[PDB]
Amino acid sequence: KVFGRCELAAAMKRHGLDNYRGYSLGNWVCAAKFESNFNTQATNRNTDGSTDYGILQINSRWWCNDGRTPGSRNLCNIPCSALLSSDITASVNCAKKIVSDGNGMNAWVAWRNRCKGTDVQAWIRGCRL
């Protein structure tokens, strides 16, 4: 499913992301924009043989099991395929754990490079939240 911007903001608000660990909702919408273009089915293979999955591009080295990433952790205890669902619950639950881990949202390269220090509120502007 390819979400709308305000639709995504709304589903994220409902799953507790607005202000989770101090990151306003605009940050998470922005991250999703640039990580996956709001598409829950997005996959990107990394050079280390790991794969990023879903709306927030959660990585198979650490966070989810995809069966083809040698000696990987499954820190979110999910098959990575569960991250590609139209229901964003599993992605949101795994992300809350990632962002608690110490790097905060710096764990997402697109956020660090494209959202951090920008006016992230723009991404929720005009949405009935």
Closer of 24 and 74 to Cl ion (Cβ): 24
From 18, 48, 52, 66, the catalytic residue:
52
The answer to whether 67 and 61 are in contact (CB under 8 A) is no
Q: What is the SS3 assignment for 124?
A: helix
Piece in contact with Cl ion (CB under 5 A), picked from 30-38, 47-55, 81-89, 97-105: 97-105
Nearest alpha carbon to residue 104 among 16, 12, 3, 28: 28
Rounded CA-CA distance 25/79 in Å is 26
The H or E element containing residue 112 is helix 109-114
Piece in contact with Cl ion (CB under 5 A), picked from 18-26, 48-56, 74-82, 88-96: 18-26
Contact between 118 and Cl ion (CB under 5 A)? Answer: no
Active site residue 7: no
**101 labelled binding-site residue:** yes
Active site residue 35: yes
Near Cl ion by CB under 5 A: residue from 79, 104, 110, 114: 104
Strand arrangement, sheet containing 58-59: 43-45, 51-53, 58-59
Contact between 24 and Cl ion (CB under 5 A)? Answer: yes
Closer of 30 and 82 to Cl ion (Cβ): 30
Q: Active-site residues: which are they?
A: 35, 52
